[PDB]
């Protein structure tokens, strides 16, 4: 069973301060947050990878480590002492520089076995929506839900004619539990012979999915 590795956090040092940073608020309950995001960017699996570490103090990103640079770089003056301090530590620098390999590439290989290949087929359904006396433009709804990954194509057709106008959508909606959903609506006033169609394409399917109304 493969073990996922974590990124190593360097210790910051004191001894100095900056002249009053900034609030932009006041009166509110004071809070203090040390937040770090170590991001592995895979441009094509492990073939091309960039590591980007980002440090935040409250609402401000103040320090960054871009594997293409090979050193820490201050984003705001609040992170400069850490950049200078850590950049003068060859051992730490070598460890960080190697993480694109010991953490990013290492963990991808693990996740490539179950996250990269995850596939959940969508459920497609079409249905009208208004208030009965359509009055103005009517609305046809193509509901596509419960799918993964997010890459999906949802197109409306008017007698084999792809509607490139009158489209109203929720866009890609992330449910937070590894599934997505979306509603792609077409504004049009129906006509029996004139049939509307929803075509859905996704990497979990073999052939497009169509639904007529």
Binding site for ligand NAG (CB under 6 A): 17, 19-20, 44-45, 47
* CB nearer other proteins, residue 6 or residue 160: 6
d(CA 43, CA 47): 8
Assess 171 for contact with other proteins (CB under 8 A).
Answer: no
Q: Is 38 a binder of other proteins (CB under 8 A)?
A: yes
Calpha distance 79→162 (Å, rounded): 52
131 contact choice in ligand NAG, other proteins, none (CB below 5 to 8 Å, kind-dependent): none
Residue 178, preceding bond cis, omega within 30 degrees? no
Of 79 and 156, nearer to other proteins (C-beta) is 79
145 near other proteins, rule: CB under 8 A: yes
Query: Exactly one of 68, 91, 135, 177 binds other proteins (CB under 8 A); which one?
Result: 177
Give yes or no for residue 43 binding other proteins (CB under 8 A): yes
Give me the least distance between CB of 77 and ligand NAG, in Å please. 13
Which one of the spans 104-112, 130-138, 158-166, 204-212 is the region binding other proteins (CB under 8 A)?
Answer: 104-112
> Residue 143 in contact with residue 173, Cβ under 8 Å?
no
The residue among 18 and 69 lying less far from ligand NAG, judged by its C-beta, is: 18
Q: Which residues lie below 8 Å from residue 199, measured CB to CB, with a gap of 6+? A: 153, 154, 155, 156, 157, 208, 209, 210
DSSP conformational letter for 132: S
In the set 89, 102, 125, 159, which binds other proteins (CB under 8 A)? 125
State phi, psi for 210 to the nearest 5 degrees.
-120, 150
Cβ atoms of residues 58 and 33 within 8 Å: yes
Q: Is 134 in the site for other proteins (CB under 8 A)?
A: no
Instruction: Look at residues 81, 39, 31, 38 and name the one whose alpha carbon lies nearest to residue 57.
Output: 31
Q: How far is the CB of 203 from ligand NAG (least distance, A)?
A: 16
Residue placing its CB nearer to ligand NAG in the complex, 11 or 19: 19
24 binds, among ligand NAG, other proteins, none (CB under 5 to 8 A by kind): other proteins
Neighbours of 201 (CB within 10 A): 14
């Amino acid at each position: 069973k493969k073990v996922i590795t974590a990124f190593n956090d360097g210790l910051k040092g004191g001894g100095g301060s900056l002249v009053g940073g900034g609030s932009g608020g006041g009166g509110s309950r004071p809070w203090f947050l040390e937040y770090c995001k170590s991001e592995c960017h895979f441009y094509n699996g492990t073939q091309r990878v960039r590591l980007l570490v980002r440090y935040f103090y409250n609402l401000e990103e103040n320090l960054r480590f871009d594997s293409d640079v090979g050193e820490f770089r201050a984003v705001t003056e609040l992170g400069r002492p850490d950049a200078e301090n850590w950049n003068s530590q060859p051992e730490f620098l070598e460890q960080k520089r190697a993480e694109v390999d010991t953490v990013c590439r290492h963990n991808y290989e693990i996740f490539d076995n179950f996250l990269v290949p995850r596939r959940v087929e969508p459920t497609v359904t079409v249905y009208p929506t208004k208030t009965q006396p359509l009055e103005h433009h009517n609305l046809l709804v193509c509901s596509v839900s419960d799918f993964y990954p997010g890459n999906i194509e949802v197109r409306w057709f008017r007698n084999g004619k792809e509607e490139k106008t009158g489209i109203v959508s929720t866009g890609l909606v992330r449910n937070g539990d590894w599934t997505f959903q979306t509603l792609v609506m077409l504004e049009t006033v129906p006509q029996s012979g004139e049939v509307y169609t929803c075509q859905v394409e996704h990497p979990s399917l073999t052939d497009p999915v169509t639904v007529e109304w």
